[PDB]
Design a binder for this molecule. Structure first.
Ligand code: NA
Length: 445
């Protein structure tokens, strides 16, 4: 760590780590989609299957690297911050160093947030009273083993970190990494998850306004929506942050794009419920991402959202979207609905923008502007993007996963009282911290 260039390279390495199939290369999406009601596993083995079946245990999480990889990134990220804070970097390029510091803090906030929503019960269950993951809110000592902190403690840190990050970061685009827009989009999400509905609405609203005034981001039009999901259209106008993948880099056959593809590893489908939701409205362009085929003597539909240049060749090089503009519209819509008043009027406007982009013949009237209606819009819009499980559970909903072509023994009702709505703490944590608590319900050998 001698120069600002060294710092830029270190920060770049954080995203290299994040792109692994164990985290944002695949596992995060398997986790968010396969645990909802809109996607399911096929008979194939792997992370889609174990997530769908909530087949997780302390000696085998069966959830990619959703513990190890974010923790590893947090350690490397804090090494960067510490170098900067200790005065290790040469002078002269200070504005950029500050941008890199902010960006590093944004990475830390994302990693800790993911750990919190994977290993702690939803904040909204209990005002964050349950235990989250260990909280990497500092440079960890050589022989220090941080304890578990509460979900509330993690949110306090995550929000403060990201609020500060935003003030330091550049608005310039850097494809494959977060910029100030990405960081604000993530913060609006986190405010929403934290029940800070006014903060979520006000931020989401201003971010949309700023995208419009600058022209720097824009919603895909109805007629261009399917093409916007192509490998030929990377870093599109909605994308604040996506993981950069290529044909020559890992992940290839274990990238989310290859796992979901019928012609790739065929790990999952949309559910009959999602397919029926969409095909009842053929004018909605989001249904054009579904592809019909035949599995175990039934019609099924798979999700062709990570689109290569050839229908019948599964792609190795698809980028995974992490933060895009449509989510921000839905955050404003959800928070506005929860707030009522003027925020509701405005949030309905944003909801309709997404509804009508999907199908211009549709609308949502004020009489129909309910939380369930906004969550149904999220279902439609964000399938395959890792949201559904979290969006239902944080709103205290029961996820119903029954009938259709669901697999035998699927958990048919999942809510925030289900002990496997969080992953277990890995058994090897108890080597150095034997008195650390395991999540309730799980065994402790
Ligand atoms: Na690849």
């Amino acid at each position: 760590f001698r120069t600002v260039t060294d710092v830029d390279n270190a920060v770049n390495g954080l995203y290299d780590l994040m792109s692994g199939s164990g985290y944002y290369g695949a596992a995060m999406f398997a986790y968010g989609d396969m645990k909802g009601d809109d996607m399911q596993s096929s008979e194939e083995s792997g992370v889609c299957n174990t997530c769908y079946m909530f087949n997780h245990r302390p000696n085998s999480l069966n959830a990619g690297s959703l513990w190890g990889r974010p923790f590893y990134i947090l350690r490397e990220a804090w090494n960067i911050l510490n170098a900067i804070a200790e005065g290790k970097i040469e002078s002269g390029d200070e504005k950029k160093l500050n941008a890199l510091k902010g960006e590093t803090m944004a990475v830390i906030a994302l990693c800790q947030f993911d750990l919190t929503r994977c290993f702690g019960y939803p904040y909204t269950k209990d005002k964050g009273a349950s235990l989250g993951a260990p909280l990497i809110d500092h440079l960890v000592g050589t022989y220090e083993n941080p304890p578990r902190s509460t979900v509330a403690q993690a949110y306090d840190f995550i929000i403060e970190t990201l609020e500060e990050a935003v003030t330091l970061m550049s608005e310039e685009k850097n494809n494959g990494r977060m910029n100030k827009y990405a960081a604000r989009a993530l913060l609006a999400r986190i405010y929403l998850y934290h029940d800070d509905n006014r903060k979520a609405f006000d931020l989401a609203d201003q971010l949309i306004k700023d995208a419009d005034t600058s022209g720097s981001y824009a919603l895909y039009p109805h007629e261009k929506y399917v093409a916007a999901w192509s490998v030929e259209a990377k870093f599109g106008s909605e994308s604040f942050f996506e993981i950069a993948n290529s044909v020559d880099d890992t992940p290839g056959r274990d990238s989310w794009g290859y796992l979901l593809n019928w012609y790739g590893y065929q790990k999952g489908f949309v559910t009959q419920k999602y397919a029926e939701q969409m095909l009842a409205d053929p004018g909605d362009v989001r249904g054009h991402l579904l592809e019909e085929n035949k599995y175990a003597g039934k019609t099924v539909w798979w999700l062709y959202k990570l689109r290569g240049t050839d229908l019948k060749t599964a792609p190795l090089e698809c980028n995974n979207v992490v933060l895009r503009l449509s989510e921000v519209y839905l955050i404003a819509a959800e928070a506005g609905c929860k707030l009522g008043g003027d925020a509701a009027v405005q949030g309905l406007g944003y909801l309709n923008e997404i509804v009508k982009r999907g199908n211009p013949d549709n609308e949502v009237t004020m009489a129909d502007y309910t939380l369930d209606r906004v969550l149904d819009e999220r279902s439609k819009e964000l399938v395959g993007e890792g949201h559904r499980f979290f969006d239902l559970l944080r709103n205290g909903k029961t996820i119903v996963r029954k009938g259709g072509y669901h697999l035998p023994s699927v958990d048919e009702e999942v809510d925030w009282d289900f002990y496997k709505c969080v992953l277990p703490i890995p058994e090897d944590q108890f080597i150095f911290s034997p008195e650390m608590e395991q999540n309730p319900g799980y065994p402790k050998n």
